[PDB]
From Swiss-Prot, chain B:
Localization per Swiss-Prot or TrEMBL: Virion; Host cytoplasm
GO biological process: microtubule-dependent intracellular transport of viral material towards nucleus; symbiont entry into host cell; viral penetration into host nucleus
GO molecular function: DNA binding; identical protein binding; RNA binding; structural molecule activity
Keywords annotated in UniProt: Capsid protein, Cytoplasmic inwards viral transport, DNA-binding, Host cytoplasm, Host-virus interaction, Microtubular inwards viral transport, Phosphoprotein, Repeat, RNA-binding, T=4 icosahedral capsid protein, Viral penetration into host nucleus, Virion, Virus entry into host cell
Shown segment, full-protein numbering: 1 to 149 of 183
PTM comment: Phosphorylated by host SRPK1, SRPK2, and maybe protein kinase C or GAPDH. Phosphorylation is critical for pregenomic RNA packaging. Protein kinase C phosphorylation is stimulated by HBx protein and may play a role in transport of the viral genome to the nucleus at the late step during the viral replication cycle.
UniProt protein name: Capsid protein
Similarity section: Belongs to the orthohepadnavirus core antigen family.
Keyword Cell membrane attached: no
GO cellular component terms listed in the entry, alphabetical order: host cell; host cell cytoplasm; T=4 icosahedral viral capsid
Subunit organization: Homodimerizes, then multimerizes. Interacts with cytosol exposed regions of viral L glycoprotein present in the reticulum-to-Golgi compartment. Interacts with human FLNB. Phosphorylated form interacts with host importin alpha; this interaction depends on the exposure of the NLS, which itself depends upon genome maturation and/or phosphorylation of the capsid protein. Interacts with host NUP153.
Gene: C
Length: 155, 148, 146, 150, 138, 155
């Protein structure tokens, strides 16, 4: 079929591609982050959220890709080819999973609407030539639990 | 981490292993069944259900694993060497995704608890030797006052 | 001693021998069924039932002969003597444990009384010559006193 | 699976390992003790108790292991392989069943709680060096109304 | 026995590994910090806190570990013993010594909040990462 | 710094040296005892007691010491240097940890002043020449809280 993994999350593959290749953390940094922030939730018998379900598959899937590419490597006769298949995976699909794991980790950390707002805010910022570009990049942070109008009300 | 893809859906990796490798359809037949029964829902911009979400990633991820395994196969030069790869795929990640594709498709079709009690029913049926096993495999699927 | 492992469960070794040796599943298929169907019960600190006690040590006891089986392949300089051992484990005591593992798994799955009536019904059915015998084999489908 | 045979009886494999190997009686002395003390119960067609169920399996399963070790004695031509297995059966597996047979026989004779407190008591006692260790080894052992006198 | 030194203090070995190995100061700078900030408490006959008790053992244990490495490194090329401590026990103790010293200095909740804040910050590539790193208050 | 690991527990290094070096069990036998008596407490997320905290760190530190000693002893050629690495552990760090492990394990089992009263009682006992020394060593058992006469008086 033509399945977009971001469509059920109010985004698209093309929208995620608006962020430059060098913006996303490495795969290991994303995997280490998901474990640090969400290991209890990711291993729990609760759905928790659609982001948890997607992130659970993506972590396992990338593991399967690395498991298969590494096993094929240990069979190649040339030791200089030991990591050749792993390198092909990282160049052919490495960015795809870096987008996917970053999208779900950040959406759980900052909120989906906040993440999508930051996406277009940073994509315009990074494409501004540096002479006109302000030094402070757009900040990605969670919105406050209660609004200012609410706090002044209960005063 | 130690993430069981089936734990959030009320099953385990070990429970799905109870079904033999030759029970599951081919991955090509499994993908065509997900398209036939659920193409519009799987492509919709809606969560629909956690099965839909998981099934969406599995279909895409298998495409990643298939073109990698195919690339390794068509770039090899030895029928022995590429039978090694096919036998590794069929035993490990190929079997893993035939299980996960079957679990979610069937859960969307027959129901999760119907699927699970079928799982244990067929698993002991197929392990009964043929001379004692019934030839029929298990299937996957008022008062008088009421009329007055 | 003279302990019969089935006496406390309402059967005897001779009654279990009424079933032909090829009726029982393989040990691999029996151990996988005990796991898929009763993993959490067999591992819990609960007695559950006398079947669970017998099953627990039956699994561990077979695991002892099958860990003796991987042992005759890492410590034996004679791959012949390696094969003479694993052949005895699987075809001599193997039939014995297939009977024992099948008995307790089936009793927890279908009921001890149901299993015993099936045992007699199938044993007579398998011994009926096939001309007179119906082609379909008979179908197999909490508190304990001291 | 990951089954601990003592878990359902309020103990663990690691706890039984706290007793040194030379503490347990021999298998022969264990079988003779279960026979002298519980032959009729173990042979009866009653469940009796979970300790009886477990002890019945252990006695028979050890019988299978000894039958194999005697069979392997006449049927294995290579002596280096034959005596490697008969030693592996009566030493590595022997210690395994010496704990099992001792645990269930002792629990029937002295009670599960008395057995568990003794196990811990002897483990720290036998690990105390003999110069500081008391010579008495810890012991494993086990109504009238007022109207009668007035 | 599978004991996690951080478990009784509300953390895990896995959570501490989220901080990169180049974030922690050296054991020497960490021991010098514990001396400047807590010598009187650490040498006193009072428990003070479980953090003090754990920190007391860790300081002494590093002494035991370095004396053993010193004796091997001398009484016997042995640049592997220095590369062993630097890459194995050194990182294990830099994490442990930092955890307890920072908890006494800033608070367990504040240290844990900073831990996940810096771990995500340092993993953001510098192009998108803000210039001001998260701080430990002091 | 100059930390005495027994100071916060009402003892000193000098006081623990009063016990002969052959009075203590091996480190293995002491660790075997700690697991058999306190595996649940030592692995629990609760502080329990300062003794639990100290015993916690001592167990892990011995693993660090033995792993470093193993790696050193593994990559040595001459077996005499192998035996020299094991002999260093035996005479130096082993005695210190046999004292520290025994002190905390006993304190959790019998109480601080019971093991301290026993320490001085055995240290004087074993230093008595065997001719005047009673044949049976003093027993390590917790002091009965009160006498039986006072127990019946307050019944
Ligand atoms: C963390 C922090 C603390 C304190 C102050 C700022 C930040 N961070 C940021 O302002 C930030 C800006 C752009 C992108 C990211 C990101 O995408 N990081 C990221 C996402 C997922 C992941 F797994 C690893 C790193 C930022 F964090
Ligand atoms: C369909 C039908 C019509 C009419 C009558 C019966 C059936 N079917 C079944 O009783 C059935 C029994 C066992 C396993 C399966 C399965 O696993 N199929 C399957 C699952 C996923 C998939 F993608 C493709 C095929 C059955 F369908
Ligand atoms: C399962 C089923 C579903 C549906 C319909 C029938 C069956 N089964 C049977 O009619 C059956 C008949 C004889 C013996 C056995 C058995 O003893 N199997 C067995 C027991 C334990 C074990 F570990 C493995 C296999 C049967 F299941
Ligand atoms: C009997 C007695 C009479 C009189 C006084 C004492 C005893 N006994 C004991 O104080 C005793 C102490 C340690 C271990 C055992 C044991 O484990 N024995 C054992 C267990 C199982 C078995 F099959 C054979 C012997 C003790 F009996
Ligand atoms: C146990 C017993 C049972 C029964 C009767 C006596 C004892 N024991 C003692 O009267 C005893 C006397 C001095 C020192 C020790 C010790 O220090 N042991 C020790 C401490 C820690 C450890 F991990 C291992 C052994 C004693 F046990
Ligand atoms: C001190 C200060 C004064 C003034 C302004 C800022 C700071 N500090 C920090 O913003 C800080 C940020 C990250 C990590 C550390 C740390 O972990 N340091 C550390 C911890 C233990 C130790 F032993 C030695 C150094 C920071 F201090």
């Amino acid at each position: 079929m033509d399945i977009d993994p971001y469509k059920e999350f109010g985004a698209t593959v093309e929208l995620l591609s608006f962020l430059p290749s060098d913006f996303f953390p490495s795969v290991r940094d994303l995997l280490d982050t998901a474990a640090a922030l969400y290991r209890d939730a990711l291993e729990s018998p609760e759905h928790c959220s659609p982001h948890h379900t997607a992130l659970r598959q993506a972590i396992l899937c990338w593991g399967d890709l690395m498991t298969l590419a590494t096993w094929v490597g240990t069979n190649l006769e040339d030791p200089a080819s030991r990591d050749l298949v792993v390198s092909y995976v990282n160049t052919n699909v490495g960015l795809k999973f870096r987008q996917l794991l970053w999208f779900h980790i950040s959406c759980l950390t900052f909120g989906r609407e906040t993440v999508l707002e930051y996406l277009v805010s940073f994509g315009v910022w990074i494409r501004t030539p540096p002479a006109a570009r302000p030094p402070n990049a757009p900040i990605l942070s969670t919105l406050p639990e209660t609004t200012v109008v609410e706090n002044l009300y209960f005063q």
